[PDB]
Structure formats: structure tokens, C-alpha cells
Amino acid sequence: MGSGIHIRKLLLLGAGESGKSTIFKQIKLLFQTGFDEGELKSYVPVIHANVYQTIKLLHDGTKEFAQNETDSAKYMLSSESIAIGEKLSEIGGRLDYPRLTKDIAEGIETLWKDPAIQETCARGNELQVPDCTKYLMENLKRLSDINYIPTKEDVLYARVRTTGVVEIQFSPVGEVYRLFDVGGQRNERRKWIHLFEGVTAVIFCAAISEYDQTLFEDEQKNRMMETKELFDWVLKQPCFEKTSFMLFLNKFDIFEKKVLDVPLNVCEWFRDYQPVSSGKQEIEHAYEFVKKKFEELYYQNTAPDRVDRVFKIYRTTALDQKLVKKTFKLVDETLRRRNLLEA
Ligand SMILES: Nc1nc2c(ncn2[C@@H]2O[C@H](COP(=O)(O)OP(=O)(O)OP(O)(O)=S)[C@@H](O)[C@H]2O)c(=O)[nH]1
Ligand SMILES: [Cl-]
Ligand SMILES: [Mg+2]
């Protein structure tokens, strides 16, 4: 007879921007209380910063593209849009938390309509233009409103690179989960190893939509290749001999749009992909091909004294509250059933 308390450690791992914190926020929303008014307002400075960050990357990329174009007026901005442009890049560089006003939103919304910016957005995958860009650019009136209060959707979009280690505790529906969120950019990974003891499950986030993108850390490195190599590295860690692996193939909502426009074949790993249909048939073909690449990667890298550990794959969109709820229930049943097996 002991205390009766069973705390199981769960670890979010994955590359920078893969969706870990987003999953983390969903867990708090599902298994604890919903964000109260003060908590919602605390994200305004982040959301506003994101808007200036996004327009800056577009404004800078246009300058990059114009220098390499020698016989085109393609990436030359208007005069008004330059008067707006330069103003914003000044503000966003001297302030970590630039405020989005009615007037600033007007300039951005005007700068967004410039064909030079649009020509830049079209080549966004060659830049670090975030996926949420269209969303932000379409909600400026709401976001710049004097009494702006962020929605759950806003907060989940809100993007901060994680630089510390945060823990939450929850029991689904004396069994408790202790869930850790940590940064996944290369420099933050130095923090990983000290978290690796006594882990019941690793929840590894793989952003499957990034197959035509390059890293923040190294703009020459394909993002999907990094995820491949990173997952590979996690799987070989001695501490994880008995740890369950829950693989979230995340950003499926983005992957769905992208695959019918950008062939999987642009990523080295997916070089031999052959399309077979159109529409939803093709999307599912492409998904199953990616999933199979990850499965094979898993078995290729799991040695015999580890092959018995649990391994599951889930297709996720971290912004989708109902899907994360249903995904987490499956994960919990699997972990419970397994712990009950080794008893
Ligand atoms: N469309 C879409 N966007 C997503 C999805 N998952 C995460 N995002 C968005 O991607 C961005 C990065 O997500 P985030 O949760 O911060 O990644 P991270 O793994 O925590 O990144 P880091 O801390 O290691 S730098 C956020 O703006 C978030 O809203 C998704 O499934 N679909
Ligand atoms: Cl099972
Ligand atoms: Mg994070």
C-alpha cells in the first residue's frame, strides 16, 4: 500500500515551429479551464508583434527579389506603399512589442494590396513568411480595434518561439499526466537531454506541410529533412528504450492545400513520389506516402531491445480543438492499456 498517486511524464518534442506549444495550449483548454478575459488579453502584444513581423518579412523579401531580377518591374513597390513600408520596418525594429493601431493597420492593409508584395508572397516558401500570414492580413480591422479581445483561434495562431521549459499537470476525464513543453529550434534542443529521464511517452510533432520550406536556423536546409533527421535522433536515445512514441503528423490542414499545388518530389526524401489521382483521392495518396516514409524511418531506427515499445501515428491539425480532444483520448487509452499490460 503506497500513496495511490501515479504521475506519468509526457514530453513534447519536434523541430522549431512544428506545433508543440499549440498542442500544449489545446491541452490546457481541454483538460483545465478555458482562457479567462485577462489571459486572452495577454496575447494581444504577441498577435500585434506577429503582424509587424509578417509584413516586415514581406517588405524585406521584395528587396531581395528585386536585386536578383535584372529585366523586370515585378518587385518594385509603389511610392505610397514605400512610405508605409519604411515606416513599419522602423517601428518593428526598435520595439519588441509594436502596437497595432487603426492608422498602422490602414498602411499595412494598403501595403498588402501592392502587387510587388503579392509577387513576393507567391514565392513565400523561399522565405520565412509564416503560414498564418493570410489569416493575419485578413483580420486587421478586428485586431486593430481599440477594445480588441483575442479569440481562442487568435491565441492558438499567436506565435512565440519557446525558450524555456513549461510543465502542466492534468488527469483526463490517482492517475496524473505531467506534460512538458520545450523549444525545438536547434539551440533550444541543448535543453532536451536533461528532460529525458522517466518518460512514459514522447509526443513528437512533425510538421508534414514543410516539405518545400527551409529552416529558420539555416535557410539552405530543407525543413522536412531536418524533421526526418531529428526524429531519427530521438529514436536512438537510450533513455527511450521503453518509452511510447506518439507521432503527430501535424499541420494536415496546410498539407491538404499544398500537395495539389507543390509536388512532394521537391523534398529529397519524397523524391520518388508518383501522383495517381486528383482531389481528395490524391491528398490521401500523398498523406499515406508521407506516413509510410515515417513508419519506415521508425522501424529502420528502432533496435531489437526497443522494438516492443508502443508506436502510434496520428494525423493532426493542432488548431482544431475537436481533433486534438479526440486524438488525446486515443493516446490516453493506448498508454493506459500498455501500463496495464506491463503489470
Ligand atoms: N495551419 C496550422 N498552423 C499550425 C498548426 N500547428 C501549429 N500551427 C502554427 O504554427 C506556428 C508555430 O507553432 P508552435 O506551436 O509555436 O510551434 P512550436 O513547436 O511550439 O515551435 P518552437 O517553440 O519549437 S520554436 C504557430 O503560429 C501556430 O499557430 C497546424 O496544425 N495547422
Ligand atoms: Cl493499442
Ligand atoms: Mg513552442
From Swiss-Prot:
Role summary: Exhibits a fast rate of basal nucleotide exchange. Guanine nucleotide-binding proteins (G proteins) are involved as modulators or transducers in various transmembrane signaling systems. Together with GCR1, may regulate the cell cycle via a signaling cascade that uses phosphatidylinositol-specific phospholipase C (PI-PLC) as an effector and inositol 1,4,5-trisphosphate (IP(3)) as a second messenger. Promotes abscisic acid (ABA) responses in guard cells. Involved in the blue light (BL) signaling.
Quaternary data: G proteins are composed of 3 units; alpha, beta and gamma. The alpha chain contains the guanine nucleotide binding site. Interacts with RGS1, THF1, the pirin protein PRN1, GTG1 and GTG2. Binds to GCR1. May interact with ADT3. No interactions with RACK1A, RACK1B or RACK1C. Interacts with PLDALPHA1. Interacts with CAND2/PMTR1.
Disulfide bonds: none
Chain residue ranges for the region called G2 motif: 154-162
Residue segments, region G1 motif: 9-22
UniProt key word RNA-binding: no
Annotated Gene3D superfamilies: GI Alpha 1, domain 2-like, P-loop containing nucleotide triphosphate hydrolases
Main location: membrane
Recorded phenotype for the gene knockout or disruption: Hypersensitivity to ABA and glucose (Glc) during and after seed germination. Altered response to blue light (BL). Abnormal roots architecture; more auxin-induced lateral roots. Reduced H(2)O(2) concentration in melatonin-treated guard cells associated with impaired abscisic acid- (ABA) and melatonin-induced stomatal aperture.
Subcellular location: Cell membrane
Binding, Mg(2+): S21, T162
Tissue specificity note: More abundant in roots and/or leaves.
Gene that produces this protein: GPA1
Keywords: Abscisic acid signaling pathway, Cell membrane, GTP-binding, Hydrolase, Lipoprotein, Magnesium, Membrane, Metal-binding, Myristate, Nucleotide-binding, Palmitate, Transducer
InterPro entries reported for this sequence: Gprotein_alpha_su, GproteinA_insert, P-loop_NTPase, Plant_Gprotein_alpha
Presence of keyword Cell membrane: yes
GO molecular function: channel regulator activity; G protein-coupled receptor binding; G-protein beta/gamma-subunit complex binding; GTP binding; GTPase activity; GTPase binding; GTPase inhibitor activity; metal ion binding
Protein name in the entry: Guanine nucleotide-binding protein alpha-1 subunit
An individual GO BP term: adenylate cyclase-modulating G protein-coupled receptor signaling pathway
Cofactor(s) required, per the database record: Mg(2+)
Domain G-alpha: 6-343
Family: Belongs to the G-alpha family.
Entry's free-text remark on domains: The helical domain (68-188) is required for self-activation.
